[PDB]
Design a protein around this ligand. Structure first.
Ligand SMILES: [Zn+2]
Ligand SMILES: [Zn+2]
Ligand SMILES: [Zn+2]
Lengths: 42, 45, 49, 56, 49, 308, 69
């Protein structure tokens, strides 16, 4: 038994990054969007 | 070789194609290339 | 200035009215296609590229 | 229609393969090769067809 | 000469929008064609039709 | 051995061969540079799939999944039928090995290239007579070790062994066998540089210092000490791990960081006796194992190094 | 970002009155209207040039120089 292999840290890291990098929430769309920086009010 | 500038400590470095991109003094991994020393013309309009 | 158009003062434009900057950034990477083929930043020559 | 459309021909026995123009292969950086979706489907048909022939 | 009518004259706040003609003007006589349909490509930045 | 089917665009009028050809991409034309005659017009610049030619060769496959409307009964049987393919079974073994390589590399927080090299190394050296009596675990570890060296992120034997359970016997023999396969195919069909050298102790120091949490200034000094550490014959034959760790320990006391030799050995699994034993020999060459600018500046003085 | 050199409408030089305008407001405790009239800006085209100006150069100067000689 190797605890380093029993728990894979990529599952949490990859899932959160994928869900935030793209709009898809899961594993709804458009939840995350590129922040507008054209002007302060925007 | 070409001269680069560190983005944090403002260290002026000289790097070759074999040297790794990093500041040899502070270790920052982003280097800003030095501005050209050749004259550039502009119109005042 | 008819139909939602306008007339601007050229002299005001010359002095710097509503004159703005524009910045565009270009990104590029030295992709390494596995273990054999790799890219590099270089000034290519017409005799070798 | 006897000449053109017979009921028996609604069942596919020989599958025509569209030419490459219908399923062109695109390139993104030209160091990577991509194939049309039809090409993979045709590949799947061949793999399934060969598997069935061997089994029977 | 004086204008027979009097003009509503005063300061006002105006803002320049992101839309500029230099980023929209484009024309094509001939150019690249799509690999699939062999028709003019889509997009001003790609010399499309 | 096959039909030519090759077309060369030459100007019929100029007749100069080879010709000067300019590709007017915007105009979509191929025009002779000397006379301006157009040699080819109507030039061409998701409806596709991302395919990797090397690590997967020529293998095309499609998956079966649910849609907007679908009965669960059909999906299960179709997947069962797809799995029972004799021809696709052979390639699945390589894919299965790739999946395990991906899991090992991902769990190691290694870069993408390292994973790619490991997968490619396995494919090139798999299905060979020499490597048939070796455990698959050793094969994967050797490829991962090879991949790390290629990407200038070379790891240690102990580091890789922490994840993949393989003893030194099979791993070393497998690696030597694997290296020969790559070298044989290299010239026949590059592979290695000065990085491939086993010692390469300069690459380990930055990571070892990071584990100890030392400042980059200490790490830079350790690199200089290790670089000049190879000039002494009495320690030149020592393992690269000991050379790097002992050099790090020497600089730790030079800069007076409150870290004892026990911590250095414990974190890097190096025996305490080895650390002190190696330090004794390096203590006789302090002049040649310390940076000249640092001592000249006055940040570190040789008197601060404890003497035995 | 910095005080414009000339008035947009008429071209009067107003870029040499920014420091004077600030000095009047701070040291002399004058209101904006009196300070502008004291500086000689009578047309409201000139008044708005100095009255509505935002000095963003000071904010930029807080950041350290990218390249130091
Ligand atoms: Zn720096
Ligand atoms: Zn010609
Ligand atoms: Zn004015």
């Amino acid at each position: 038994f190797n605890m380093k292999l029993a728990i894979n840290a990529k599952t949490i890291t990859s899932g959160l990054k994928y869900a935030l990098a793209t709009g898809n929430w899961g594993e709804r769309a458009g939840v995350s969007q590129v922040l507008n920086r054209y002007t302060y009010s925007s | 070789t070409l001269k680069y500038i560190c983005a944090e400590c403002s260290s002026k470095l000289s790097l070759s194609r074999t040297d790794a991109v990093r500041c040899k003094d502070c270790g920052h991994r982003i280097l800003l290339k030095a501005r050209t020393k050749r004259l550039v013309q502009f119109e005042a309009r | 200035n008819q139909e939602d158009s306008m007339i601007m003062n050229q002299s005001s434009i010359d002095r710097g009215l509503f004159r703005s900057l524009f910045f565009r950034s270009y990104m590029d990477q030295e992709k390494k296609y596995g273990m054999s083929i790799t890219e590099t930043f270089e000034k290519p020559q017409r005799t070798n590229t | 229609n006897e000449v053109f459309s017979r009921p028996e021909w609604m069942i596919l026995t020989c599958l025509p393969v569209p030419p490459p123009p219908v399923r062109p292969s695109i390139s993104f950086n030209e160091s990577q090769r991509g194939e049309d979706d039809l090409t993979f489907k045709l590949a799947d048909i061949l793999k399934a067809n060969i598997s069935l022939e061997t089994l029977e | 000469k004086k204008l027979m009518a009097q003009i509503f004259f005063g300061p006002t706040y105006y803002q320049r929008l992101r839309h500029m003609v230099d980023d929209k003007i484009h024309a094509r006589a001939r150019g690249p064609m799509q690999v699939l349909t062999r028709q003019p490509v889509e997009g001003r930045s790609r010399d499309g039709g | 051995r096959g039909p030519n089917l090759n077309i060369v665009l030459t100007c019929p009028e100029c007749k100069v061969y080879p010709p000067k050809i300019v590709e007017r991409f915007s105009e979509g034309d191929v025009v002779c540079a000397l006379c301006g005659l157009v040699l080819s017009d109507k030039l061409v610049d998701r409806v596709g799939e991302a395919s990797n030619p090397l690590l997967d060769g020529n293998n095309l496959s499609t998956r079966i999944g649910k849609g907007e409307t679908t009965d669960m009964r059909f999906t299960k049987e179709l997947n069962k039928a797809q799995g029972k393919n004799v021809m696709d079974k052979k390639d699945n073994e390589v894919q299965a090995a790739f999946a395990k390589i991906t899991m090992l590399c991902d769990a190691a927080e290694l870069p993408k290239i390292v994973k790619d090299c490991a997968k490619e190394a396995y494919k090139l050296c798999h299905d060979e007579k020499t490597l048939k009596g070796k455990s698959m675990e050793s094969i994967m570890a050797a490829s991962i070790l090879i991949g790390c060296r290629r990407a200038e992120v070379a790891r240690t034997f102990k580091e890789i062994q922490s994840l993949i359970h393989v003893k030194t016997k099979e791993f070393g023999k497998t690696l030597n066998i694997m290296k020969n396969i790559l070298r044989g195919k290299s010239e026949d069909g590059k592979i290695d540089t000065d990085n491939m050298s086993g010692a390469q102790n300069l690459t380990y120091i930055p990571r070892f210092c990071s584990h100890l949490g030392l400042p980059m200034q200490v790490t830079t000094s350790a690199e200089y000490t290790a670089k000049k550490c190879k000039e002494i014959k009495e320690i030149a034959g020592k393992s690269p791990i000991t050379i790097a760790v002992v050099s790090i320990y020497l600089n730790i006391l030079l800069f007076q960081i409150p870290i004892t030799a026990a911590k250095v050995g414990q974190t890097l699994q190096v025996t305490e006796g080895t650390i002190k034993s190696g330090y004794k020999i390096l203590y006789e060459h302090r002049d040649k194992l310390v940076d000249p600018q640092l001592i000249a500046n006055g940040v570190v003085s040789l008197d601060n190094l404890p003497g035995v | 970002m910095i005080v414009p050199v000339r008035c947009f409408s008429c071209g009067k030089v107003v870029g040499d009155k920014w420091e004077s305008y600030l000095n009047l407001l701070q040291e002399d405790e004058l209101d904006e209207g009196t300070a502008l009239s004291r500086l000689g800006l009578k047309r409201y085209c000139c008044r708005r040039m100095i009255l509505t100006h935002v000095d963003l150069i000071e904010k930029f100067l807080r950041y350290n120089p990218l390249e130091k000689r």
